[PDB]
Amino acid sequence: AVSELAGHQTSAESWGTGRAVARIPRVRGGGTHRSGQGAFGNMCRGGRMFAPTKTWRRWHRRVNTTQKRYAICSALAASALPALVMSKGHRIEEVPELPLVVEDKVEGYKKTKEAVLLLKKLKAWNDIKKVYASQRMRAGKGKMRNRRRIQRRGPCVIYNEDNGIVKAFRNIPGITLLNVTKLNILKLAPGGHVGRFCIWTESAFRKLDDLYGTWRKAASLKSNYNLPMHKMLNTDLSRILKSPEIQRALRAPRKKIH
Amino acid sequence: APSRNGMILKPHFHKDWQRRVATWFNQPARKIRRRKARQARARRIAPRPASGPLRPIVRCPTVRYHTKVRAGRGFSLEELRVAGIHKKVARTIGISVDPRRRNKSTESLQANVQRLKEYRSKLVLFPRKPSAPKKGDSSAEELKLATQLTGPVMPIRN
Amino acid sequence: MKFNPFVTSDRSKNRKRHFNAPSHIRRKIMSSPLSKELRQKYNVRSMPIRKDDEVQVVRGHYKGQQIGKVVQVYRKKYVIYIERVQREKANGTTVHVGIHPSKVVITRLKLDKDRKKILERKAKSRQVGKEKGK
RNA sequence: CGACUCUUAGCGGUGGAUCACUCGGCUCGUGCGUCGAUGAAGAACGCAGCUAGCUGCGAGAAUUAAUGUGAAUUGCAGGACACAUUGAUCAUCGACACUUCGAACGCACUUGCGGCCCCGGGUUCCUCCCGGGGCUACGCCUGUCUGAGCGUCGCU
RNA sequence: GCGGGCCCGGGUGGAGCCGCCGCAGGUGCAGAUCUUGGUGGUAGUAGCAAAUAUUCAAACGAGAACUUUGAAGGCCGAAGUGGAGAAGGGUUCCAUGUGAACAGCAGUUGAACAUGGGUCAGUCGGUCCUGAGAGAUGGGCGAGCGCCGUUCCGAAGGGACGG
RNA sequence: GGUAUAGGGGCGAAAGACUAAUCGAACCAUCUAGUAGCUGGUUCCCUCCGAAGUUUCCCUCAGGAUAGCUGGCGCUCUCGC
RNA sequence: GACGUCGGCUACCCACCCGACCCGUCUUGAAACACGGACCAAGGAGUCUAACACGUGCGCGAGUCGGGGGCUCGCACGAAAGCCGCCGUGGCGCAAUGAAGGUGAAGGCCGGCGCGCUCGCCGGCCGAGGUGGGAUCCCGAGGCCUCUCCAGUCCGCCGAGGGCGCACCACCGGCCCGUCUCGCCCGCCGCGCCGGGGAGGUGGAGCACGAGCGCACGUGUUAGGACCCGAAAGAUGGUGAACU
RNA sequence: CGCGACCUCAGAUCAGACGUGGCGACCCGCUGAAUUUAAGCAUAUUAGUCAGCGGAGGAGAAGAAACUAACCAGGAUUCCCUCAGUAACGGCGAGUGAACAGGGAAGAGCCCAGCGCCGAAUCCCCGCCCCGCGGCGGGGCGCGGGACAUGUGGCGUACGGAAGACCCGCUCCCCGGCGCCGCUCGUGGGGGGCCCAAGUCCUUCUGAUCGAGGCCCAGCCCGUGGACGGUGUGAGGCCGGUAGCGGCCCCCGGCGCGCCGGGCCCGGGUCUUCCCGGAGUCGGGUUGCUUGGGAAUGCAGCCCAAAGCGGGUGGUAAACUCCAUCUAAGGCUAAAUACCGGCACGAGACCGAUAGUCAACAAGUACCGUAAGGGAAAGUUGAAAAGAACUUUGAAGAGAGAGUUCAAGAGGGCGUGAAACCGUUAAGAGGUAAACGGGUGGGGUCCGCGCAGUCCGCCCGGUUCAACCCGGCGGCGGGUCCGGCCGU
C-alpha cells in the first residue's frame, strides 16, 4: 500500500473564480518553484493517486477443504498418464515406469552426489538437464525486486520420512521434496497445470492408500473423507460410439450435402 | 435511493472507521509466538503437566445448555475438606482452588471428591530433596515416568 | 540456498554494504587467489592481497605471464596498482591502470608475523573441515 | 531556374520524452523496547595543512585512551612508522574528556552587575587590583541548629 | 488484419527481452479556463522619451561615445546633485587582477567575480537610574498548561555604629 | 523611538474606515479529500439489440421514487422428421 | 517483349473531377456572433472494504462451513501447506404463527362400541389428496413388405387408439398459528375464574416427502473520500499595532 | 520574671535525597466542537471524535464480586469467535446499539484499618571493627540521638480468626559473601572477533567474458554449500559469503555442587470460650453531561442524610411478603493485550526519478513571510580519466589538425536523444487560407524480377536387388480360453 499521508502533507487552497487558473488547490505563498502549482488531485504533479491502495484489501482467499482434497487427488491421479506428464514439459522418455517407485534406501542417502547418481540411474536426470538449460534471466522489475533468476520445475520427490533425503536432494535445481502426509497442491500442480513428474518411495506409495483410501474404504487418516465419484465411468467415448448397442439404433448418416 | 425491491439495510460506517481498522496480518506470527511461549513454559516445568492445574467437573447455568459438563475454575473448599486436602497445600500440589464456589447438590460434590481422589491416586510427588523424606513416592515410580502429560490432565468428557 | 533468517540476500542492501564497507572489511573483500604452487604448499585457497606481493594478471587487456610486484592497494577504489600494468597519458607520463584483485593471482607472498599466523589458521580450519567431512 | 511560402526525406540545432539500470522510498512481520539537575531534547559558536556544504567532534574540538584486526589514508605534499613493532588505517568502545544558551540554577539577558571561602601574581592579610578554583535558583521529605507566640500548662 | 494493432528490411543504440496456458492491476486520453516541463506566430515587434548638455586632444588598451587625464561649455545654486549621523544592510569599505555570468547598448569601468587588508577608548556611547509600562515571591483563582495583582488575606530589612 | 489595546476582538472627530499591498469580521495550521439536486471532464476495436422526455407521489418544478420504453440471463412447449 | 524495359493494390510529392463548414459538450436545435482549445512530451479520473439482491461455475448435501484455537518448522521456497473426540462450540438452513402469556403442520378407507348424531371411543389397512393442461415412457389393433402360393417364428418403420403420468400453471379440497361466531362433550394429584376437543369465516413472510451451506465470478443498490476537480460558509488552537 | 516541657509556626548557601523538562506510535485522567447526514433544520448524527491540558511504562489501564444468573447453577482481570447489527435507544426518522451464557489464549493469588493478644517486642540517623563495596548491604560493639503510645512491629482479614484442650505425624526455608564442575536448544544461551569445498581447464567470439563447444556418467570437480553481491557482459567452482549437532579466542546471563556468616524451634484434624467490618459514605430529592439502559445505566455541583439477622443487586415507578446472590465507601499483583515514535533486522504478485516519503543528490536544504508557518527543482560520460599531449587562427570565448577509447556519432549537467520548433541539402508545387474523402494520372524512393521466368510435381514410351526361398530378431491380430496369472 501507499502511505496515507501521501499528497495531503501539503497545505493547498484553491484560487477562486476571477483568475486564469483552473480552480485547482495550489500551494499557498512562498518564493519557490512549488508555489501556486496544484495539489490534492490525482491529475496534479506529485498529488495523490486516485483510490490509494490500502493494506486491508482482501488479499487472502478461502477454499473448501473438500475442494482442496479433490484438487490434490486429481493432481495425484494425473501424475500418471504419461501423456499429461510429457505435455507438461517433463522429459520422461527414458523413464522405465511413470509411477516411479524407489526403495526406502533413499532416505538413508545424505549426499547430493548419491542423489544425482540415483536420478541418473532412474533416467530422470534429463529433467534436471533441461532445467539447467532453462536457467535464465527474468524480464522486468523482478530483477530489482529479488526475483532475478528463473528456472523450470524439476521432478518432485515424495518421501515418507526425512532421514537425510531432503539434505541430499537440496542442491539439485528444480527438485522439490514433499512429505506424503503434507502434500502441497501448489507444488503438485505448478502454474495450475495438472501434469507433474513425481518420484515416490515404497513407503510413501503404500501410505497414499492410508492417506486417501479407496472407493470402498474410509481414509483412516482423514476423519471423514472418501475419493470423489466419477460422473462417467467409461470415459473413452470412441469405444462407446462404435459399439454394436449404439449403432444398432442409428439412422444412416446423410453426407450428400447439396 | 432504493431501487426495485432491495433489502433495507443500515451500514454502521458513519464514523472514522478507516482510522480504527484492525488488520490481522500478524495472526500467524502471533500464533508462532504463543506456541513458542507454551513450549518454553512446558520446558520450564519439566515434570509438571503442560496444560496446568487440575480443573473440576462443572455444569452450566442458562438452561439453554443445562446438560453440558465443562472444566471449572477450581475445586471448592468443601470438596477439598471432604477429600482431606488442605486448600493451601492443594495450590502447591497442583489443584486449582477457588473460594467462591458453592455446593447446592451432593452429586457435583461427590463427583469432584472422586476426581480429587483419582488425581491423588495417580499423582507422583517428587521429594523436596534427593534423599526422599516422608510422603515422597518411591524412586521406582520416578525413573519410569518423568515426562509431561499432553493436553488437559484427566480431561472431562460428557 | 541460505536458511539463516539474519542473512540479507537482497540486491539493494548487499550493494550498499559492499560500497559502504569500512576499510578492514574492504581488506577482506579485496582478496585474490594464490598460485597453484602456493595453494599446494600452504593448503590455503586464497589470501587478501598486500602492498608488495608478486602477482600475475589473469583477465583483462594486461593478461600475461609477467610476475609484477604490487605497487599499492587503493581500497577506496577497490583496486590495486602493480609494477608494470600502466599506460601513458596524453602528456607522456605513465599512470598505473588499476586491476581488480579478483582478476589476479598471487605468485609470491609477503610473509610477516601476521601473514604466517593467518596462513596457519586457514590451513588448520581447512584440515579440521576435511577431517569432519571424512 | 529567382525570393517567400506548403508537404515529405537525410543530416545538423532547443528539449530531455521512452527503455534499461537504483547505496531511495511505501507496506507487512520479528526481537529489544533505553532520555534528563552525575545537567535531556533542541539551538548557538568553534575544531582539518590546504575546508565552503553535508557528516563527525568540543579548546584533549576531522578526534584522546583501551580491545579486536593487521600495512595503510589518499585530491597533493608532509610524513611519522622499521608492518619481527600495542603497530598505519578501520570496527568495537567498557576509561578520560565533553565551549555557550537551553527544565538551566547568584540577579537579569546587555554577555552587564554581584556576594561567601581558598590559592597565586600584588602582598609579607594590607586592605585595593589582577588571574584561577569551589558554592550562591524554586518547591518539597527526614533529621539538625537558632528562634516567635496575652496557645496549653508545672516550679519560683 | 474491416478494425484495435501486429510481423519483417535498413540506421542509431549497447544489455536485457518475448511467444503460449492461467492470475492480479495504480492497465489504453483530444479536451476537464486539466498538473508539470519545453517550444512557436506575435517579433527582431512594443520598448530602452520624467528632472536643459555635451565637445576636443592625449594615455592605457587587440578592441573607446560611455575608463582616466588636461582644456572648453553647463547643471545641483548652501531647505544642494555638498560635508556628517540615527534606524536599517553586514563587508556593500581599501588595494591588486579578470572580463566566464550581472550592471535591459557597451565598457579597459562597478556596489560583479578572485585574491588578499581594514574597525585600537576611564574621558565617544552601551553598562547605571527611572518614565508610560512589563513582570516574580506572598495571596487568590483555575480540571490543567497557567491566570489575576504589584502592596494587595505577608514573621517582607541577613543591614549598620557603639559596647 | 519606547509602550498599551489582538479578531465576533481591538480601535475609530464615525468613512463599515484601519487592524502588515486582504477587512460588512485579519493571517497560519488542522478538522478537510467539509457538502453540492449545480458547471466541466471521463482514456482501445469490432459485432448484436436498442430507447424517453409519458403515469402518480414528494416544500416537488435544473431532482428523486414508481409504472412505462430497453437489454441480458434463461426456462416450458409445437414443428418440413 | 526483354539490359534501361517490366509489376508494386498499399505508402512520398504534385495535378485534375466530384464531395466536403472544427473538434468535445449543454441542448428540441451548433459550423455558429454558445462555451474549453497555440503546439508537443509525461501524469490523469468508476478503485477498495463492508452489507445485500439476482445470475453463473465448483464442492458437499438435510445438511454445510472453517471463523478462532491447537498439533507439525529452525519461515528459502512459508508468514504457505496438512491434520484436529476441537468436525462443531457457533452462523445459515431443516417450522411457522401471535404484542405476549403460548401454541405449533395428515389424513383417508374398512369392522365394531355409543342413536353413525357429518360427534366421541376401540382394531386393521392405504398411506402426502383431487380435476384440467402436461415434455418424455408403456401397451398397442393394424399396415408397409420380402423374386410365386401357403404356413411362419424373428430384425424393423409408421402406427389409429388406449395408460402411468416428471418439472410447471390454474383451481378445488386438507393441515399449523392469531382472531370472530354457534355450540356439544371429555380428563384428573389438587373438580377450579382448570386444561383439551368441533363446525363455520378470516389474517400469516406458513406445511402439503426437502435444498440448503461454503468459495469464486459478473451486474445493480447503498455506507464509507466513493468516478475526478470545484465553492460562498463552520469549528479548534496559535501569530501579527515594522503599515494603519 | 525568668527558666524548663509540649502544641502550632518561620529562618537557613544547615546534613543527606527527591520533582521540574523532552519524546509521545500504544495507554490513563479531564475539557471538547463544527463541517456531514437527516435530501431543509432546531432533538438527534458526525461524537467522548478532531483540537486543547496534565501523567508513566515497556507496555498502560483493569483485576481477584457490595458479580452473573433463576439454572441440576457458574465464579479475578485482559484478548479472539459467537451472542449481534440482537435486546434496547431515536422529530421510534435518519440512524445508534450492548450485555449473559458457550468455545478458546493465559491463568496466581493476596495484604491492611478495625477487633484483639504480646514489657514499642518497631523504624530512621550518626561513631568504631570485619566482609564487601561501578543497581552502599550483613553482623558485632555504642547509658550516641531521633521518630513512635494522637500507635510501629509479630499473629491475624471474611475462603472465618484468635486462645485453651489434647488426637496424629515429625524437625528445612530464605538472605549476604567465598569458590567449583557442566558453555546451557534451533538444535552451542546472548554479544564480539578470526577462519573452513570445488576449473580462471583446452579451443573459439569480444574492447573486456561471467558468452558458445568440449573434457573417464549433462558435459571437469564440490554439493548438509545450485541464496546474494562484487569482479571490464549472462559466474556453483575469481573473491566475500552461503550450508553445516563446523572449528578456535574472549565477555555476560541463568540453571546446578562445596564452604562461611547468619535469620528460623516455623504443622494438620476434632472439641470448648470469645471476636468479627472502611460516614458527609450509602441512600433520597435535584439538576447538567453521558449511556442501548428506557418513571432516570454511569459520573456529578447543591440540599437532606443513615442502619446493623444491616446494606446493595434481582433491566417498569410504589406498598406488603418470602427468596437467590455478594459484602461497598482501603490497598498490591505478571499472563494472554496495543504499539504509523526510538534502536537493530528479515520480506515483498508494491513505485522505479512528473512514480515511490516533501526529501534516491550538500532536504525540512536553497528560498519566501515580521510570525505562527509555507517549501522546492535537482540521478546516469566512460570497463578503466585513458578527461583530448602537441601544431596552428583568434585577445579570449571558440575552432582546424593530431591523439585516447570498440565507441566523444560517449568531450566534465557528457548513456539511449523522440515530438512540438528551428537552420541547411534534395525533389515537387504554388492567384479562391490551409487541410480532408472517393477515382485516376504524372514524377521519385527503393522492392521482386530477368541477360526467357516458359514454375514444376506424379505415370508412361524411346549401380544393385525386390519377385521367391533359408536363418535370426521385432511387431500386430485372433480363437479352441489352449495353460497360468489378472480381473467384475
From Swiss-Prot, chain A:
GO terms for molecular function: structural constituent of ribosome. Keywords: Acetylation, Citrullination, Cytoplasm, Isopeptide bond, Methylation, Phosphoprotein, Ribonucleoprotein, Ribosomal protein, Ubl conjugation. The modification Phosphoserine is found at residues 238, 243. The keyword Repeat does not apply. There is a cross-link at residue 187 (Glycyl lysine isopeptide (Lys-Gly) (interchain with G-Cter in SUMO2)). The modification Citrulline is found at residue 248. Citrullinated by PADI4. It is found in: Cytoplasm. GO terms for cellular component: cytoplasm; ribonucleoprotein complex; ribosome. This is Large ribosomal subunit protein uL4. It comes from Oryctolagus cuniculus (Rabbit). The lineage of its organism: Eukaryota, Metazoa, Chordata, Craniata, Vertebrata. The chain holds residues 53 to 310 of 413 of the full protein.
Curated annotation (Swiss-Prot), chain C:
The gene is RPL26. SMART domains: KOW. Gene3D superfamilies: 2.30.30.30. PANTHER family: 60S RIBOSOMAL PROTEIN L26 FAMILY MEMBER (PTHR11143). The keyword Ribosomal protein applies. Component of the large ribosomal subunit. Interacts with DHX33. The lineage of its organism: Eukaryota, Metazoa, Chordata, Craniata, Vertebrata. Residues 1-21 are annotated as: Disordered. This is Large ribosomal subunit protein uL24. One of its GO terms (biological process) is translation. PROSITE patterns: RIBOSOMAL_L24. CDD domains: KOW_RPL26. SUPFAM superfamilies: Translation proteins SH3-like domain. It comes from Oryctolagus cuniculus. It comes from the Eukaryota. One of its GO terms (cellular component) is large ribosomal subunit. One of its GO terms (molecular function) is structural constituent of ribosome. Transmembrane segments: none annotated.
